[PDB]
Amino acid sequence: TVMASLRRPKRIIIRGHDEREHPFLVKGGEDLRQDQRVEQLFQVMNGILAQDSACSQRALQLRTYSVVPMTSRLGLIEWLENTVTLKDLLLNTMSQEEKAAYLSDPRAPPCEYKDWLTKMSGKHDVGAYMLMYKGANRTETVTSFRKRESKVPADLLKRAFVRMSTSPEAFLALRSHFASSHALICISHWILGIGDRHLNNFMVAMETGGVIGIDFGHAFGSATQFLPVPELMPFRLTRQFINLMLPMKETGLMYSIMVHALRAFRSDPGLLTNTMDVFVKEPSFDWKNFEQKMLKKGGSWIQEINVAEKNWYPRQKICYAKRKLAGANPAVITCDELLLGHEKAPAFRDYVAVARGSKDHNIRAQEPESGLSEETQVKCLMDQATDPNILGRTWEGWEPWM
Amino acid sequence: SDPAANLHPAKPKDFSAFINLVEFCREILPEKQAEFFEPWVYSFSYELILQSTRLPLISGFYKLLSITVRNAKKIKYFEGVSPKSLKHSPEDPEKYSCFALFVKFGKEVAVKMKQYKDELLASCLTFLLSLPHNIIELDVRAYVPALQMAFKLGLSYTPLAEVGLNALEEWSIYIDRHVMQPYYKDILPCLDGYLKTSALAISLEEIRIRVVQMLGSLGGQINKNLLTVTSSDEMMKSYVAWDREKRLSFAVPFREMKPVIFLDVFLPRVTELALTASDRQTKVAACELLHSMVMFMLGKATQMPEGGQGAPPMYQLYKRTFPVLLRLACDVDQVTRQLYEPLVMQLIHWFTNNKKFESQDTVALLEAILDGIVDPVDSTLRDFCGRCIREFLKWSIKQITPQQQEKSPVNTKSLFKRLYSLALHPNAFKRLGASLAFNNIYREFREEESLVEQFVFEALVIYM
Amino acid sequence: LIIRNFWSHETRLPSNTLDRLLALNSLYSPKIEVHFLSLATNFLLEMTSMSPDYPNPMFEHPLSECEFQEYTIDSDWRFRSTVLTPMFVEELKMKQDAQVVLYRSYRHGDLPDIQIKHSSLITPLQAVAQRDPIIAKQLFSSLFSGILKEMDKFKTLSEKNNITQKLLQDFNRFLNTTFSFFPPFVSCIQDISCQHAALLSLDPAAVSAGCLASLQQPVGIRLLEEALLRLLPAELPAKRVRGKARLPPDVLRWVELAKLYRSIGEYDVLRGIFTSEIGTKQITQSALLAEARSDYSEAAKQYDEALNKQDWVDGEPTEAEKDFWELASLDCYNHLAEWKSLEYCSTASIDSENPPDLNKIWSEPFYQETYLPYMIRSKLKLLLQGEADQSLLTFIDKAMHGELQKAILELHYSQELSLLYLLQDDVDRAKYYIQNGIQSFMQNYSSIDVLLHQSRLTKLQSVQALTEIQEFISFISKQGNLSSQVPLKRLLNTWTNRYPDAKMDPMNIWDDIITNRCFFLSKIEEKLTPLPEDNSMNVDQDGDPSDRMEVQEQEEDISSLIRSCKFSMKMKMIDSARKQNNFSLAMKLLKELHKESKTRDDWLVSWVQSYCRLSHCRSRSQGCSEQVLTVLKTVSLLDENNVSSYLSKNILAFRDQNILLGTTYRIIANALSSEPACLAEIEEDKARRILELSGSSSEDSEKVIAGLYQRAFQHLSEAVQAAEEEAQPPSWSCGPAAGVIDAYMTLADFCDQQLRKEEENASVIDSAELQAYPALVVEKMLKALKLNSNEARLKFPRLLQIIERYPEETLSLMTKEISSVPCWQFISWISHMVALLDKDQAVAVQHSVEEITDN
Amino acid sequence: SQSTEPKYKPLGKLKRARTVHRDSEEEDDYLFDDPLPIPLRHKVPYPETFHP
């Protein structure tokens, strides 16, 4: 079976001598050593979470699948059964009238975003984002982003979970598992500096509601330092995730899970920091491998010529990871990444201002640059994730509306 | 494929004599403290094991062996043979030979008991769970599934529950904790299944009391494994909707208005009651209502929709319903059997018709039959699925025209190719299902002369 | 049937098929609550046959041409049991008149028959609804929804509003007037209210009470959230209405939702609800943060500060905030095992007089639910600890003089009654209460859904405690176990081998188990006192104890064994509490054990090491100054000759004490290096003590740090030398290897952190003393990897990095030492080892890669 | 002595224990080793309330 996705992989089923079937995904022309190393990092994270009492009392574990490279151009990836893409679930939840209008219709948010980029910047390419960054105001961006958010149904995840479940108990269990898995994934991805979290990089377990993260191409600020359109977001906490907990707020279960996981991670960081140090200084992780990977896939269209140029320094990535594993402001870290990568740009000041805040509506701009507690760090992370100023200037493929 | 099927004793009087002898030995043999049974353990066990090996379908040998092993434990016969071949015979070679013979017979019985059922299974489980703790301490895993089956059947058959409880207590008390620790997550879920029935021969109240005491005595570091199976895999299942949309719209008639209700919200509980209900009246009512809803589903699917939209797709619903119908058509009951076997035959005849063909509904029916024929637990369902495959081919080759077969799914060629794939599958039950299927088709296969001259050498090579 | 036809007749049930629903709603009594759904469904569906569309067939066309034959009737035989009978073998007094009945009709053919009567679906639906509560529930809900939706088309707005108000009043009456609390009935009513809008105004108190009684908390939670979302009662915070005493309706729904979520066991949602909605002050947020950080002492202090404060600049807090504060302070005192405070708090609000009258507990329902369990638990714990007071027992006896109070005491606090009687002898009766407790556990566990993990885990802990209670009762009820010492030895071994989970069980379970076990040991010590009223009279009368003091001098009488078992159990509880990040409880238990710890050398050294471990764990989440103060308190007990005398006898305790002291010195040095002027920030005595402990002649801020680092390295090296210097047998399977692995990893981690600190910042000093660091790291990590340490296995690539950085120091050392490690311990880092083959520093891994290639 | 005719057997008091003095008045030698005692809990609401 050919999978309808990027690079068009294929699914094969292997019959073992144990009288069982083992589905696998065959990927050709794609190095997968980075994925294997990231899975090993997640296994180390799982062990650290398992040895902590507060997280063990809630069973906080990241779901890890198997990645095996057999050649520097071919490998095998374990196939998860009874799982679906988050984007696919959101699209299938919508009715025919809703789907056609978002999918194929003028004035739709996928088209309104491009129309707004054309309006605030006389360009039809990647430079429109740069011109909008230099030539737009916070009020206009916030109002336009809210008006664009208002055009997408506000209870897609809730309606989907209602439709799958048969009893209120099943709905409660599915929603709780989804929220806990997403919070753990968000905090673990922020610690590892993983970006490019669009709706096709999340897989939902349709039987239990769990969430799985896939397709780890960027690591340690690669989406904030090397992309033509930078990603100033720690993780994906969009309108649908907030609306899933309809009567309550994000300062409850998700906040508690993130705080507990961050407290577990920050205690004795030696094992984690050493493992990511061994990860970051590798002879097979040269800039050539990164540019080949980013060239093969579309992403933000990094192009054959890179404006940010080669600034690959493994010492800075591990230093930033160690800094954020201590008390540090996420806004400071992303501004440092922007300074490292986007120094020779005409919108550097606007990048820094948008990523830092305004000190009137953001809690992360009223805090010091270091020495933050776990609760304050998680609060700043949520504030930076849910900021309409940052979310209204993102890449079109990220889809900040959903 | 069931071994103890369509088989009768040559001399019915000898079986009655053996049953009377076993029942008499239950009362007489364990008497007198077994002081006098000391020199007869080996002489009894060897002959009983030889006769049981020669005749593996008689439970009386297993019962007699059960009395034999029980009397030995009061004697203590197997308290010093655990080293086995480390020392040849420090005290007595008879005890060592008896130990070795007992070890091998139990492992074979555990391996062979997976196809038995009813009385023969209850006797095999009792015999294996009455074994001394040293033999279980050798390999725990081969005896685990015996404990699980004994507990599951003891949810409805008290003596098996008592035997399993005693075996679990002995294993937890005498076997070392380090070796028994990994298996508790496999054992405790069925005790949880026992405990869940507390809302509704030793009566079940004392069985639940003993289960509670066993759970408490295990300790907090172990009894948490009581929740290992739950909240994972199947336990989440059957809690999800069969279809994300609603297909069966029913307009209840009244003299004033016609309110609309949906009958697909009743389907899971109705099928569950029709399959497994203790009371007979609710089972009959559920079976009748399921028959009515199957008729309603067929009529709604075949009805030309009044609206501009197409026919309502019943693929998801048919796929959940068709496996249940196959199970119901081969029930231990006879009202259910004569109610549902003609239903399955009629469904095959309808889905093999000229009108309803080359569709996903026939595909769903065929894959349901072919999945049932590879059931690794139920053999009656396997037989019935073989008979369904015969009927399917017989009505597929007749109803269709000689034309309208090129590039058409659900054909003779396609059915053979699925059987050929099943036959080459490394799993043991897939090959068994393919062989049973061919054994049910060959009468219809040999009649078509044109079909034979192209389907004999390939089938011969495939089955060899 | 006669009564059914009487009620279905006209002038008693209108046939307008819309007023009939209201008539059935009015025709309800709590006595028939079990069968009410089936009765109402039968009454609704009985009028379906009066429609002209009932007799005619449903589907007008068959699937194809199929001639149906004469009706086939199954053979109605007499059922027999076959599961219990001999196999391969060859009365119906009331079953013959209660045979299987049948409906509809059948017709065989070569195609299925879809041309069926319209009654062939209606009749079996109601037939199976009458014999199953769930099917009746679904049928009633579907019929109600359909009738409502169809009446929406054929009614005006005023009539629709009137009938919805009538339905809401009827549902409020249903929820308020019931005693059986049938789970299908309340679930049906609440679901029907949930799927509609005008029914969303259902009374929250009745919903909460019904869902608490019938355990339909998910249904109640769903109803409350849709009521909070879809209603939008008021969104004006300026309070446009006139000012009055009553609390807002939305916060009442929030309180009920919080109650349901607390009952279901989800404390994170409860904390979020109290943070975002109930809480309106700044002290509440800090108290909730302290509670979430498991710092119950600070949270309780803040709760009392908020409760006694009498002047508010912002404004008077709402009553919901105040009762939440009181309940949370009660929970915090329960968590801290502060029984004397818990008892006051519980008895404080009953009366203004100094002695409270406990009878007023039975006055209000609010007092019974929130104060009674805490008061009972605190008084029982105080009695079981050894204190004397009769208030609880007088209250218990006067309450069981009644019948409702006795019933609701027996329903929940059956274990407490068992312990209370067992204290005051009465061994015979307490068996009845413990059997009642076990049966109530069965009922409560069986009444909980399988999708709720937390409640079943809590009930598992409860049944563990109840089983231990019953086991002790069974042990004490027989006089044979009193004689000799073998049954006491068996019980002690079982008790020390059966422990709660350290990482997974809360402190309440440990507290209950430990208190009950200590009470049982006290009772068995009191029972096994010498028979004469004067001590040692029987001892001098008989001759056995005279010769037992000479031959059996290895151990002492039962008192010494009981004391040793109590000490070991309390130390295990202390370690569990330290692992679960509960520091105040650990401090309390450590002081209580200190009272009598200094009577034996091993007990004293174990207490000192446990204290030091707890203080080391406490230091992690504090500032540099607090770190320094904590470990400065710690350091005064590991440099004493009185315990060094015993440390000279046992080599394991010496190694552990050296490890702990090295850890203390490392913590001091790391805290000082990460914050200059921290020594100046603390008083002169502590600074002088740190200066003396440093051992540096200079008075600057760097020589002291260097001296403390040197002392830490000296103590860690001393510990590793003590471990290596034949401190133990080879000890295969790594039995006592935990301490050796700990010493290896502690020294290796200290030296590795020192090596990392030199690489990060540019070095100006020669630092020639670090030449022994990397070889030490490599060698000790290799022995730790040999001893099967997971941490060394995940820290392996650091050794390769060290080899790359400092080749001539340790390349040959690793090459010699890596050859003895098992080959299967390098599978995880196989990629690094095969990518380190074309480099100069490859000789070390050639043997390993050859070994794994061979295996 | 009032055991009573029925099963309750309500107990007037407890023969067991009743010890008047428990533990050393010294109550643990080292103040420094353990942290200051938690403030004693204080509460003074208004009694005789209806549904508080």
The string over B202-235, giving b where at least 16 C-beta atoms fall within 10 Å of a residue's C-beta and e elsewhere, is eebeebbbbbbbbbbbbbbbbbbbbbebbbeeeb
Task: Determine phi and psi for A74, rounding to 5 degrees.
Answer: -160, 145
Tell me the technique behind this structure: cryo-EM
Long-range contacts of C688-691 (CB under 8 A, 24+ apart): C689/C632, C690/C628, C690/C632
Extended strands (E) in D1-52: none
* A69 DSSP β-pair partners: A75
Residues 6+ apart with CB under 8 A from C314: C281
State how far residue A165 is from chain C, nearest Cα, in angstroms.
12
Token pair in block for residue C330: 């009660």
The residue assigned the tokens 């639940």 is B208
DSSP assignment letter at A157:
H
Give DSSP secondary structure letters for C369-411.
Answer: HHTHHHHHHHHHHHHHTT----HHHHHHHHHHHSSHHHHHHHH
In chain A, which residues are last before a break of more than 2.5 Å from C to the next N? none
Environment class of residue B309 by beta-carbon count within 10 Å: exposed (0-12), middle (13-18) or buried (19+)?
A: exposed
Long-range contacts of B409-416 (CB under 8 A, 24+ apart): B409/B358, B409/B362, B409/B363, B410/B357, B410/B358, B410/B362, B410/B363, B410/B366, B412/B451, B415/B366, B415/B389, B416/B455, B416/B459
Neighbors of chain A with 3 or more C-beta pairs under 8 Å: B, C
Q: Resolution, in Å, please?
A: 3.3
* C613 DSSP β-pair partners: none
Contacts of B199 in chain C (CB under 8 A): 443, 446-447
Environment class of residue B382 by beta-carbon count within 10 Å: exposed (0-12), middle (13-18) or buried (19+)?
A: buried
Neighbors of chain D with 3 or more C-beta pairs under 8 Å: C
Whether A219 and A38 have beta carbons less than 8 Å apart is answered as yes
Rounded Cα gap, residues C744 and A213, in angstroms = 37
Residues 6+ apart with CB under 8 A from C429: C421, D7, D9
Contact (CB<8Å) B198/C442: yes
Contact (CB<8Å) C112/B343: yes
Contact (CB<8Å) C74/B215: no
Contact (CB<8Å) C390/D13: yes
Rounded Cα gap, residues C454 and C269, in angstroms = 14
DSSP assignment letter at A84:
E
Rounded Cα gap, residues C798 and C816, in angstroms = 18
DSSP assignment letter at C136:
H
Whether B264 and B247 have beta carbons less than 8 Å apart is answered as yes
Contacts of A257 in chain C (CB under 8 A): 268
What is the separation, in whole angstroms, between the first and last Cα of chain C?
82
Contact (CB<8Å) D39/C304: yes
Environment class of residue B86 by beta-carbon count within 10 Å: exposed (0-12), middle (13-18) or buried (19+)?
A: exposed
Largest CA distance in chain B: 94
Chains D and A touch (3+ CB pairs under 8 A): no
Amino acid (one-letter) located at B286: A
Contacts of B422 in chain A (CB under 8 A): none
Rounded Cα gap, residues B6 and B8, in angstroms = 7
SS3 B374: coil
- Helix C684-694 × helix C651-673 angle, to 10°: 120
Residues 6+ apart with CB under 8 A from C631: C615, C616, C619, C664, C667, C668, C671
Token pair in block for residue C831: 């990629």
- What is the distance of C-alpha C175 from the center of its chain? 32
Task: Determine phi and psi for A380, rounding to 5 degrees.
Answer: -65, -35
Contact (CB<8Å) A267/C791: no
Query: Cα–Cα distances in Å, from C122 out to A352, C56, C203, D35?
Result: 70, 13, 35, 75
Is some CB atom of chain D closer than 8 A to the CB atom of C351?
yes
Contact (CB<8Å) A163/B239: no
* C249 DSSP β-pair partners: none
Whether A39 and A65 have beta carbons less than 8 Å apart is answered as yes
Rounded Cα gap, residues B433 and B423, in angstroms = 8
Whether B399 and B356 have beta carbons less than 8 Å apart is answered as no
Is some CB atom of chain A closer than 8 A to the CB atom of B237?
yes
State how far residue C58 is from chain B, nearest Cα, in angstroms.
9
Contact (CB<8Å) C132/B282: yes
State how far residue D28 is from chain C, nearest Cα, in angstroms.
5
Whether B129 and B135 have beta carbons less than 8 Å apart is answered as no
State how far residue A44 is from chain C, nearest Cα, in angstroms.
9
Is some CB atom of chain A closer than 8 A to the CB atom of B376?
no
Q: Order of strands, edge to edge, in the sheet holding A74-78?
A: A10-15, A21-28, A74-78, A67-71
Token pair in block for residue B246: 């609603």
Task: Give the residue from D9, D33, D36, D51 with the most C CB atoms within 10 Å of its CB, the best one to mutate.
Answer: D33
The closest alpha carbon to D52, from C320, C360, C270, belongs to C320
Token pair in block for residue B235: 């336990």
State how far residue A98 is from chain B, nearest Cα, in angstroms.
16
State how far residue D26 is from chain C, nearest Cα, in angstroms.
9
Contacts of C509 in chain B (CB under 8 A): 220
CA atoms within 13 A on the CB side of C724: 13
Counting every residue written for chain C, the total comes to 855
Contact (CB<8Å) B240/A170: yes
State how far residue C557 is from chain B, nearest Cα, in angstroms.
28
Contact (CB<8Å) A171/C828: no
DSSP assignment letter at B287:
H
Contact (CB<8Å) A246/C795: no
Is some CB atom of chain D closer than 8 A to the CB atom of C842?
no
Residues 6+ apart with CB under 8 A from B235: B229, C450
Helix runs in C215-318, H state only: 217-230, 249-264, 267-273, 282-292, 296-308
Strands A211-213 and A202-205: antiparallel
The closest alpha carbon to C84, from B176, B201, A217, belongs to B201
Contact (CB<8Å) B298/C63: yes
Neighbors of chain B with 3 or more C-beta pairs under 8 Å: A, C
Strands A21-28 and A67-71: unpaired
